[model samples]
Target: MTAPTTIRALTVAPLDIPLHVARNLLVAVELTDGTRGYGEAAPFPAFNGETQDMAHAAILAARSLVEGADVREWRRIALALPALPGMTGSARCAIETAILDALTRRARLPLWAFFGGAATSLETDVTITTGSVTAAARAAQAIVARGVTTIKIKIGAGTTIRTMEHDLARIVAIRDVAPTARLILDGNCGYTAPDALRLLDMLGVHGIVPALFEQPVAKDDEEGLRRLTATRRVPVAADESVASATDAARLARNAAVDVLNIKLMKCGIVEALDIAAIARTAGLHLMIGGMVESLLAMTVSACFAAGQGGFRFVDLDTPLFLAENPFDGGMTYHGGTIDLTLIEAGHGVTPRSP
Candidate 1:
């Protein structure tokens, strides 16, 4: 079937996701024939210093760049977006998501099929953000009671003589609650090498071991990453340190990270595919991670994870914190399992009024 050759509207809306201080940007590309596709850009301050207003403005400015263009020309979209002044990686992602969503709808395929994956269910690791020890234990046990098997605790600790003590205390608190569930320690680039060393001894003393330890140093500390990796205990991952395909290449080349956390907001879906391919050839493990994103973003990331085999961990649980969702007909989570079985054409996101 020959689809409409031009887009009629490139609409940008602010999605008020619950529990987040900033609203995520939603971009929709409407085809001349009335077909529509959607994409989201959930930008946070730490990643490329992008704010909601900045991203929204960027998407608005880039809108006309694709007007009357061929619907299937994704490469042209990529080339045009990078030239926009002050464009955030997330802004680029939102635009790609909208265009790709519309383009694939014309072909009548899910993003998974369009991206070439055969993954079925996306069982993810739930993130437990920083909180009081009492609260931490209770939350961990709460999710476990609901059948969550993997938990990624945000173990943020600064460089202090008592840093390891503070970090270990949180782990101990959760360990008491969810003893059966697997744990992943996420330092968020907060811990130093000394703190990382102590984490091992702390765990050794308690005979407690986590499934993985992530980014236990400053975000730009590639040298420190090597030191932490050589500390000779769990798998070390690179999160904020690696946001692009080139970043992935450097980390793999240095053998600094055992796992690479790929997020859509970092480089968008197009470059994410590039990052994933580079990591695969370099023998680095893949972990699907994202910021506090709604199911709109989560569903697309899940489909990508499902399509690409060999994801070691999935942290697409930010939607659980949303007080209410405005959309329907994408993924649903029961315990740890993100149901991609209900996936629809074009990133699987269907707009609705709540």
Candidate 2:
């Protein structure tokens, strides 16, 4: 066995594109014998205590621990990382994903297969950023045309009524174009607890009950989330609220929400998987979401999604919005299903050298 010997890291430039509010990036980790894997930690500073520089440093520091370790012991590698701060999903996520990729490569198997093979093809929802009603409608239409069956619209940033109205109008327009497409609303903590209830009522009036309503209120509003979940007509999902396995359990025990959105950076793969188990035990829906990341991170996330059978909806469409992607052949989206065929070896990420 060629015991892993060397480890190195690099920082890529920011990628700007549509539907994403933060700058994107790629973090590369190379092993001995020149075999390499990559990860993404494009942090949204507004939502978490993470900046591009901070994520970069985290990845860099993690590489030292990964060097010369047995590549197949990836779970152990991930377990050794320091606990991430509140909702620092991108930082820890990037390192954990790279470790998983390396382990799969060492095992000579696809990521999904290594993680327990795919039972069903994953369905992903296209995200529409906060925009004018017409623009949001057009975005939904374009994605629906490409065979995407679900759309998630960002809302609650401006006037609550106006945003809801605009979003509902867009949903109506999208349904007119593609009647079968499902709709989800992500407030991203833009609404107060009171406004969240009002918005839900408004959505019900329009006959626009969402597939899921994500983070309608702030992350700290556990009681508000519990109140919303009690209704049960439109399922509530927690994006920022459930940051770790412990957090997921607490939320589940309190019946805070029906769905928990697991991001890689929030708790790494091991913790995220643990949280998924909690969700299963508690009868909560599971969702695997991503920050603005390159294809590398998305591929690793797909592996986790495949293992967690309860993950009904995927928000891993970050690659579609990148202006310049560093990863080469890995994962690609075909219609609503993601093709994880390229998970053969070491993340399959070949970054164009900077």
Candidate 3:
């Protein structure tokens, strides 16, 4: 339980996490003090703009930048990351999680407690990917049967935007199966001003109004989002639009978004807390989200979103889609309910073979 005076070495090991489409590479960093911290490069090309290789290289550079720093000097290392030539948000996120995990482990406290406060059990929403209305309904039924409390319908992408019929059919199909579940509508910026508006009207008419509508239009269309935030009958949440606390502040100042989705890959845990504080001051709610990740990163995100008293939505369901968990002892998913109570010290996860 002794803290290290300085970091003597850094090791990055690759993890082949089986995901829906392909294997996600997770970076596990082992410090000289024998502390293990795990992170991954989750790049949403439209959001952060860095590849997986870039993420790995950036984390390696970060290790050198703070090589001789103490275990708790995370802030110093975080500040030095943006200066790297090809810095991506996910790369910064991975390194920040690694440091926070190590520090929390040394303190023998759960990651959430170390971040400051009691931890709350989070109920995460399972995503029903867009495709056949029948397929979506089937997925929805499966999730509801599994005891998930929330369901996120990925809609309004290029294919779905071309026709309101497809959109209506999908939601109706999902709602029919998961009748009592809380719903989230994620457009992923797949619509325009008119289409986005029409999508909501359809939801309202069909009695399928979602808990919140996320990134309804393209990221650059602030005018459209502002109008959506101002005029929508339902709540508007921002995702691709905000990458840092600065972007969050801009949204609050402009009243552009009703809610903000904070992803560790978007700003890392340290900055995400800052973004939450900024959102609170500006009267914006928080939704902790993910981009297809393992428990290695999801656990950190789960801790950050829990017990904060601000996050109204939790989209940390990416791990649920993994063919199987590649590691253990971080957080447990009981269908929709995620329990972070079982582990202590540094992200509450220890690598274990499935």
Best-fitting candidate, scored by TM-score: 1
How many clashes in candidate 1? 1
Assess candidate 2 and give its lDDT: 0.72
Write model 1 residue lDDT over 1-354, tens digit each, in one string. 535857778889888776745479888888888888888889887655788999998888887787777677887887688788878888888888888888887777878877776676877888887877787888887788778889998876446646567667878888888778788989887877777777778887987788888888888889888887876588888998999899999999998988998998788888999899998999889999887688778888888888886798999888887887878777878888877766667777878864
- Determine which window of 10 residues in candidate 3 has minimal summed lDDT: 21-30
By lDDT, highest first, what's the ranking?
1, 3, 2
Give me the runs in candidate 2 sitting further than 4 Å from their true place.
Answer: 1-25, 83-89, 158-160
Across 1-354, the per-residue lDDT of candidate 3 in tens digits comes to: 544545655555565556654334565555667776666667655444666667767767776675666767888788888898877788788778877777778778888777555455787888888898889988887898889878888876644544677878998888888788888888888888778888777778898778888998888887788988888577889899987899899988888899999988877777888898999888898898887678878888888877465688988877777877767678887767888888777787766764
| Candidate 3: residue 116 Cα off by (Å) | 2.4
- Higher-scoring candidate on TM-score, 1 or 2: 1
C-alpha RMSD for every candidate: 1.9, 3.1, 2.3
TM-score of 1: 0.95
Better of 2 and 3 by TM-score: 3
Cα-based TM-score, every candidate: 0.95, 0.88, 0.93
- On TM-score, the stronger of 1 and 3 is 1
- lDDT by residue for model 2 (17-126), tens: 34534565565555665655566676877777678777666665665566666556667777776742432457567766666665566657676776667542478888
Candidate 3 lDDT (Cα, 0 to 1): 0.78
